[PDB]
Design a protein around this nucleic acid. Sequence first.
DNA 1: TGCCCCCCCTTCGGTGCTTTGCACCGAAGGGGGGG
Lengths: 553, 415
Amino acid sequence: PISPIETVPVKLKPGMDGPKVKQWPLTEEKIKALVEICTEMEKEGKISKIGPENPYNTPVFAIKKKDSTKWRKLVDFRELNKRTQDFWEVQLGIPHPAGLKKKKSVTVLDVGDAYFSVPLDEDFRKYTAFTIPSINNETPGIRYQYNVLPQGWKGSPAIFQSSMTKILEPFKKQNPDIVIYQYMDDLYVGSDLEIGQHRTKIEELRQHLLRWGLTTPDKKHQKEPPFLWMGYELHPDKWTVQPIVLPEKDSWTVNDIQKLVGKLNWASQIYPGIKVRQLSKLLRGTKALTEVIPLTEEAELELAENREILKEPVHGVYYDPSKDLIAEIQKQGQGQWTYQIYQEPFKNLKTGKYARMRGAHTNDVKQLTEAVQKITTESIVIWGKTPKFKLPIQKETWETWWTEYWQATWIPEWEFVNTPPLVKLWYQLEKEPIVGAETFYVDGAANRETKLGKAGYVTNKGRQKVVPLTNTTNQKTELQAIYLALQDSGLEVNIVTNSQYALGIIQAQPDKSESELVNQIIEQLIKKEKVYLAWVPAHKGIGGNEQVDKLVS
Amino acid sequence: PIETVPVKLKPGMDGPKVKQWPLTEEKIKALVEICTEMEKEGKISKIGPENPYNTPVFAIKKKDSTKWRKLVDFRELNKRTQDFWEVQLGIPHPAGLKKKKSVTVLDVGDAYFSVPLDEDFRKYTAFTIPSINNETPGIRYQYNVLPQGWKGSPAIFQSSMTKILEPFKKQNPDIVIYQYMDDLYVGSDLEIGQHRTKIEELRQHLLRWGLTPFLWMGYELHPDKWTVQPIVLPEKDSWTVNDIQKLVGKLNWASQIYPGIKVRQLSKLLRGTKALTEVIPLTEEAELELAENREILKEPVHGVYYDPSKDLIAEIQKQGQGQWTYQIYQEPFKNLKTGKYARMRGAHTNDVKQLTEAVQKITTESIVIWGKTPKFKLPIQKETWETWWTEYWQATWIPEWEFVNTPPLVKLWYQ
DNA sequence: TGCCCCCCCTTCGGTGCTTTGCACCGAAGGGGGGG
Ligand SMILES: Nc1ccn([C@@H]2C[C@@H](O)[C@H](COP(=O)(O)OP(=O)(O)OP(=O)(O)O)O2)c(=O)n1
Ligand SMILES: OC[C@H]1O[C@@](CO)(O[C@H]2O[C@H](CO)[C@@H](O)[C@H](O)[C@H]2O)[C@@H](O)[C@@H]1O
Ligand SMILES: [Ca+2]
Ligand SMILES: [N+]
């Protein structure tokens, strides 16, 4: 046969043979539409018919193109993919319009039958064999093998995407004034040239692609803005995402909320202030995908707030490398954060949100540090540099945090922005014991079998307490003893525990916790004026620790 | 006309399949310029997706260096590459390198590019250059010569290296030379001027082979001036209840290292239920118990020696105010070295930058003293470290590390 | 009823010290999106 472009050697995993899966029953409406498409691939030379010496076979089906009258052919190579060698995908990410520079001339192209315009590895074509019913399995039928990249094979996207780059590489090197964003078969080409020289280079590229067997039909040739590209709309000075459809159903299932939150996440890249905490909080729970969930009072308000954000059309701007990048974060409450990235005020390049709750106990300062890290990586991906940060945290607050924390932490070059609610530390433990403050020696204990336990304290002023606890653990009683000391103490208190577990949690100054008991401890710590925590080894005959260990054990 | 040394992987192991992480604009421009020049010289060649292997790559600037230096994270490949001690291509470690008054480190990695690599092994040295905003998909390359940062390059080149060093080693028999990865460690007891003179001689000695990042840079060490940070008990004459509680907790922990420490007579001082700020005198039995404990902390730990077959482990503690402590060990509580860093670069403003400098300092000391790179237990969150550490790295090697979170319940290594 | 990539939110099981309870993390399955 004819040889299109340079092929790619493909192998099977060692000791593995081709697939033998046969075919499942197919409806007559699909069997009829398939034999028409098979004949076209034979004419163009994309598929050969000879396969009596081929014991392999892979099931085939067909579904229609996205809002297009054409049926798409697909082969379920899932058995072949298990037996095919591994590839390294050259697709490392997704391009974003916020990283595009403004250009005077723009063109968008789509390659015709891309996968079918690249020659497959000669020795591998035998394993791509497939059978199609002739007339409801009455007669044997037509067997075939792929001569090009088939849709459904795990190696098809990587092989085409790499061969596409080799063809464009000489064109890009010989035209440095041009910018080419290649993503699968779709092509973005922009320059600051006059549209006449632009359409000239565009046709030069169209011929160059045709010089390797790649068609560029005019039905997909976009010459006039707004350019539909990667699901956005590209205007000369601004860009915006294509319209987003919000399901307005009155009976929400589990699968409905999953679709709702997914669309809100996609919208948050340009629509600022999107919240999905209370809406996603409805999905937690081992519920079936069809179970109907009633929307809570907080989730209904959250959905209404998101509806108001999407009523007005929002647009982003393009990147100017001559100006700095500015990233401004705002706290939304309940561990929610939104940010905007811009270069000139009120002209956002893109927006986003960070709502990840990592860890059982945390504070806003930690969550802000994590949001900064998300933005930093996101900015390096899109623009290759770290933005200047405007954070709702005072320099004094941040200085106190990182200098005193035991883990290394840091924020890049940033300045304070007085946009409430400000992030702060809600309490600070003293570094030295408090003179004149009552000293509480706390301890706890619980039975590993009965899950029953006691927790109490004893002070230097003679004050004592022991409380029995049911359905508890060693860790819970140790926390409970600290909570008792905080409740029964003045505004200034020294507390001596032997609980490494509790002390590790509290010293990290959390302001929120998944544990109801830790949250109550946090509430007491904010009320106090001076708190000192100290640790002592257990069973060493130390102060009240030996005394209170007997009381609770 | 040089035949290639065949290389195999450890049996039962595939190749490295580590994803490429995002790179800043300045690092991508540096890699594109370097990889284009390395492609003209045949040192690398483009590959496709049929190669399932990949290794991260980025660029660094060494200390006081204005030009970029390509650096590949061959950590996953080195662990999967056969250990050349079994092929007897290992480099013995001179115990006298740590005793010389001055040690200079030279980047001799540029010489590896002259030796070809085994054809069957080139597929494992694959890497990918990313593009800003994913304008272009991954541009994958693979090595055709000995790559920098790979543990097999100095081993294969060692036969070539010892010949180039024979005239200098014989003219200067009192100079110790050690080779580790892309670096060459040269130590002598001469005067500083005569030392740098002998270093400049060794540079021009290599150019005599070069005719038949660059060699001009060098960094001076002083291992004879390296000290250790011992465990110390504070000296007070009036002790509060809280002071003694901290002391007993510290001594109780230290007893895991020194089994002779007792706290029986000091714990009995904390018999009652006293306020923490109450000053209490020391009993007669307690004064002897404290004095006897300081003597134990002076003498060395029994049974602590370096095992060449065990890995080195390093822990680092953030003490604040720019202070950083560290311990190197193989078995727990059997520390081979303890130390403390202060006023490093980035002090009082950047924790990640200081931690990066400490990791480099500890690894360098480990190479000089034992010829190994330890595995680090870093006191930092995983995402916090992986976001910034490349911006402050200035070494040609990269050690293994994991992340921990240990609150300092007992200020053990720094009062 | 196919293939490849990226993002967020939740669950679940493995791992190692807080230890036999509890906290963390990476994989996986749901969704969004791209071709
Ligand atoms: N469902 C999908 C969608 C896309 N693809 C990949 C992506 C692309 O690399 C290739 C599609 O090749 P085509 O060239 O046929 O793409 P279109 O449907 O746009 O066809 P047309 O505009 O030329 O008439 O196959 C795919 O596997 N499966
Ligand atoms: O920082 C750890 C981080 O790096 C990765 C990818 O680069 O792995 C590298 O670091 C590990 C820890 O030292 C090595 O074991 C590994 O060989 C090396 O590639 C990630 O795996 C990890 O998240
Ligand atoms: Ca197409
Ligand atoms: N106990």
